[PDB]
């Protein structure tokens, strides 16, 4: 008996009627005193119904362009779900009923059969763009993965970005492609058999191009602010339903398969059903199987248990394995002290900071709470993402740090990809591909130029605001055909063959996970009805025999991969194996 709080008769934005009738325009303001819509360039005075809700509908059909004019000021529309000419221009009318879908014999993917492959969009390809991404598609699916995550879409200002400094959310950014370049790209993944998932940002609005305010200042709260302006206020029903209309978009006209939400704890919300129970319940409605999963650091069961979500990105995995390869300890790295029995110990609570004192200066406070409600699967892990690449000063890789052999970088992706949390993958990881991943932006006038004086502060560090930043982060395809970057791929492919063939790997409890360590070498197993796998990981410096591992069972017999191809059960320095 939940009811949606929308209704496409009252949907605000520009929305085609029925029968060829043209299009029903609707904003709400605050404020204005007089409001008009310009379509095709001709002004008409729009009809007041109360409530600071306007109404016009036109004759005029999908491919319209228009803006909104309040008190005489041409103003875009923040529902516009198309921006031709960038996020200060015309929005264009667009009719999703007109795109053909194939996919009707898709019907989503669960968690616990997600491995994700986070795409960029503008960097994936030399075209950078959604028609030139499908083409990658057979590629993916032969590699292994089955769930692409793609980094925001929507529009920002700038002809390249990472994404979050998206303003106008409703609207696809127009360098990669137009409406139907994206369907077409969903429809061509869905008829591969994999799940597309789409990166939005619901805890603030990019510096150019957000124009709510213009209409009612009350969208936005200055009780707390966001990294760009106010903050976003979720006690006002219509900027919750700016989101939930959003997400309900995104899934049902695009046909993605979930959302991963940016940055939830700046989502902030004292009513009394939270912001994120209430996505959940209008993404539920739309009666699909789609997925929606937190960015969340706080270490929060409840986000999963009484959010409703289906599951957490958790960085402690992340920085426990970098910390362990690297020894570094700037920032929240000194959170960790890596290691086998420190990761051992990581994998066994799923998140190690479970109520502790949290260390780390500037920061200090008890971090986390218990992990035992969660299952293996509503933990995402990774060694490698957009964030824990390009929030370095050079945008450099885990295997280009210093002190990171190749052999160890294939060790960690044995351990992540034989356990039975959600894995993700960054584009181009799976080749240890020679190119960084850097930040880049493309703003205009003084706040481009105060955004290169930020990155140069903050930590020769590359301009973000410089072509050559973006081109330099550009994935080189042809490298992944030779050499070391070949041999990665082969172990990357053998991982996920591995992953989804071998019967007791397809363990998604933790009941049946156990870790622990002998000196320097980590090991997991896994027992269930369909037998025991153990995957040993050499973190030291030395070769170690398999037969002289200590541990509280007798090993399996069996050597299933070993991350450097060798016939006996030893391990050199960073090797893993695995054993059945
Ligand atoms: O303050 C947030 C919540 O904290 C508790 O819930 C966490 O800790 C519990 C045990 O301390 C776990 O059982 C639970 O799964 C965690 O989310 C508290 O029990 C909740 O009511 C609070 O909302
Ligand atoms: O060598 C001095 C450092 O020794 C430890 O750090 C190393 O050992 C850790 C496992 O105990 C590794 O995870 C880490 O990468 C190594 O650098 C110690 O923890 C550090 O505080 C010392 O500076
Ligand atoms: O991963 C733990 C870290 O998450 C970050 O994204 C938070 O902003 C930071 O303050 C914290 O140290
Ligand atoms: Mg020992």
Request: hydrophobic share 35%.
């Given at each position: 008996?939940?009811?949606?709080?929308?209704?496409?008769?009252?949907?605000?934005?520009?929305?085609?009627?029925?029968?060829?009738?043209?299009?029903?325009?609707?904003?709400?303001?605050?404020?204005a005193?007089?409001?008009?819509?310009?379509?095709?360039?001709?002004?008409?005075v729009?009809?007041?119904?109360?409530?600071?809700?306007y109404?016009?509908?036109?004759?005029?059909?999908?491919?319209?362009?228009?803006?909104?004019?309040?008190?005489?000021?041409?103003?875009?529309?923040?529902?516009?779900?198309?921006?031709?000419?960038?996020?200060?221009?015309?929005?264009?009318?667009?009719?999703?009923?007109?795109?053909?879908?194939?996919?009707?014999?898709?019907?989503?993917?669960?968690?616990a059969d997600c491995?994700?492959?986070?795409?960029?969009?503008?960097?994936f390809?030399?075209?950078?763009?959604?028609?030139?991404?499908?083409?990658?598609?057979?590629?993916?699916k032969?590699?292994?993965?089955?769930?692409?995550?793609?980094?925001?879409?929507?529009?920002?200002?700038?002809q390249?970005?990472?994404?979050?400094?998206?303003?106008?959310?409703?609207?696809?950014?127009?360098?990669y492609?137009?409406?139907?370049?994206?369907?077409?790209?969903?429809?061509?993944?869905?008829?591969?058999?994999?799940?597309?998932?789409?990166?939005?940002?619901?805890?603030?609005?990019?510096?150019?191009?957000?124009?709510?305010?213009?209409?009612?200042?009350?969208?936005?709260?200055?009780?707390?602010?966001?990294?760009?302006g106010?903050?976003?206020?979720?006690?006002?029903?219509?900027?919750?339903?700016?989101?939930?209309?959003?997400?309900?978009?995104?899934?049902?006209?695009?046909?993605?398969?979930?959302?991963?939400?940016?940055?939830?704890?700046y989502?902030?919300?004292?009513?009394?059903?939270?912001?994120?129970?209430?996505?959940?319940?209008?993404?539920?409605?739309?009666?699909?199987?789609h997925?929606?999963?937190?960015?969340?650091?706080?270490n929060?069961?409840?986000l999963?248990?009484?959010?409703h979500?289906?599951?957490?990105?958790?960085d402690?995995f992340?920085?426990?394995?970098?910390?362990?390869?690297?020894?570094?300890?700037?920032?929240?790295?000194?959170?960790?002290?890596?290691?086998?029995?420190?990761?051992?110990?990581?994998?066994?609570r799923?998140?190690?900071?479970?109520?502790?004192?949290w260390a780390?200066?500037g920061?200090?406070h008890?971090?986390?709470?218990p992990?035992?409600?969660?299952?293996?699967?509503?933990f995402?892990?990774?060694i490698?993402?957009?964030?824990?690449?390009?929030?370095?000063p050079?945008?450099?890789?885990?295997?280009?740090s210093?002190?990171?052999?190749?052999?160890?970088?294939?060790?960690?992706?044995?351990?992540?990809?034989?356990?039975?949390?959600?894995?993700?993958?960054?584009?181009?990881?799976?080749?240890?591909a020679?190119?960084?991943?850097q930040?880049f932006?493309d703003?205009?006038?003084?706040?481009?130029?105060?955004?290169?004086?930020?990155?140069?502060?903050?930590f020769?560090?590359?301009?973000p605001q410089?072509?050559?930043?973006?081109?330099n982060?550009?994935?080189?395809?042809?490298?992944?055909?030779?050499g070391?970057?070949?041999?990665?791929?082969?172990?990357?492919?053998?991982?996920?063959?591995?992953?989804?063939?071998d019967?007791?790997?397809?363990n998604?409890?933790?009941?049946?996970?156990?870790?622990?360590?002998?000196?320097?070498?980590?090991?997991?197993?896994?027992?269930?009805?369909?037998?025991?796998?153990?995957?040993?990981?050499?973190?030291?410096?030395?070769?170690?025999?398999?037969?002289?591992?200590?541990?509280?069972?007798?090993?399996?017999?069996?050597?299933?991969?070993?991350?450097?191809?060798?016939?006996?059960?030893?391990?050199?320095?960073?090797?893993?194996?695995?054993?059945?």
């Amino acid at each position: 008996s939940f009811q949606t709080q929308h209704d496409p008769r009252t949907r605000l934005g520009a929305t085609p009627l029925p029968g060829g009738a043209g299009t029903r325009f609707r904003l709400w303001t605050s404020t204005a005193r007089t409001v008009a819509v310009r379509v095709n360039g001709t002004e008409h005075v729009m009809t007041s119904l109360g409530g600071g809700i306007y109404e016009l509908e036109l004759p005029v059909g999908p491919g319209a362009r228009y803006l909104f004019v309040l008190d005489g000021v041409p103003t875009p529309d923040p529902y516009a779900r198309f921006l031709p000419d960038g996020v200060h221009g015309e929005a264009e009318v667009v009719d999703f009923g007109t795109f053909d879908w194939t996919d009707a014999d898709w019907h989503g993917i669960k968690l616990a059969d997600c491995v994700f492959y986070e795409v960029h969009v503008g960097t994936f390809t030399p075209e950078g763009t959604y028609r030139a991404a499908a083409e990658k598609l057979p590629y993916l699916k032969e590699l292994g993965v089955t769930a692409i995550q793609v980094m925001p879409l929507a529009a920002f200002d700038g002809q390249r970005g990472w994404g979050y400094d998206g303003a106008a959310f409703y609207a696809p950014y127009a360098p990669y492609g137009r409406p139907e370049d994206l369907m077409a790209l969903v429809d061509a993944a869905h008829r591969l058999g994999l799940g597309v998932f789409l990166d939005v940002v619901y805890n603030h609005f990019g510096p150019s191009g957000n124009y709510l305010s213009s209409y009612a200042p009350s969208y936005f709260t200055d009780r707390f602010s966001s990294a760009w302006g106010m903050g976003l206020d979720y006690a006002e029903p219509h900027m919750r339903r700016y989101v939930t209309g959003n997400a309900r978009m995104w899934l049902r006209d695009y046909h993605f398969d979930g959302l991963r939400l940016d940055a939830t704890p700046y989502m902030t919300d004292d009513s009394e059903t939270h912001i994120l129970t209430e996505l959940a319940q209008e993404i539920h409605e739309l009666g699909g199987t789609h997925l929606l999963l937190a960015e969340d650091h706080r270490n929060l069961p409840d986000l999963v248990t009484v959010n409703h979500l289906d599951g957490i990105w958790t960085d402690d995995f992340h920085h426990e394995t970098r910390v362990t390869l690297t020894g570094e300890q700037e920032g929240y790295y000194a959170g960790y002290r890596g290691g086998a029995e420190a990761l051992a110990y990581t994998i066994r609570r799923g998140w190690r900071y479970e109520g502790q004192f949290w260390a780390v200066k500037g920061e200090e406070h008890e971090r986390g709470h218990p992990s035992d409600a969660l299952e293996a699967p509503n933990f995402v892990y990774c060694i490698q993402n957009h964030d824990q690449i390009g929030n370095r000063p050079l945008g450099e890789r885990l295997h280009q740090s210093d002190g990171v052999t190749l052999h160890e970088y294939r060790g960690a992706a044995a351990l992540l990809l034989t356990l039975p949390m959600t894995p993700l993958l960054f584009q181009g990881q799976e080749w240890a591909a020679s190119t960084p991943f850097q930040f880049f932006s493309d703003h205009a006038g003084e706040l481009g130029q105060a955004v290169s004086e930020g990155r140069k502060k903050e930590f020769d560090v590359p301009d973000p605001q410089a072509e050559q930043t973006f081109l330099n982060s550009k994935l080189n395809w042809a490298e992944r055909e030779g050499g070391e970057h070949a041999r990665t791929l082969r172990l990357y492919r053998d991982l996920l063959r591995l992953r989804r063939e071998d019967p007791v790997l397809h363990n998604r409890q933790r009941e049946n996970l156990t870790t622990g360590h002998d000196g320097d070498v980590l090991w997991v197993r896994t027992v269930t009805g369909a037998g025991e796998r153990v995957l040993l990981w050499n973190l030291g410096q030395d070769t170690r025999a398999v037969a002289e591992v200590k541990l509280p069972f007798t090993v399996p017999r069996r050597l299933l991969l070993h991350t450097e191809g060798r016939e006996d059960l030893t391990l050199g320095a960073g090797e893993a194996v695995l054993v059945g």
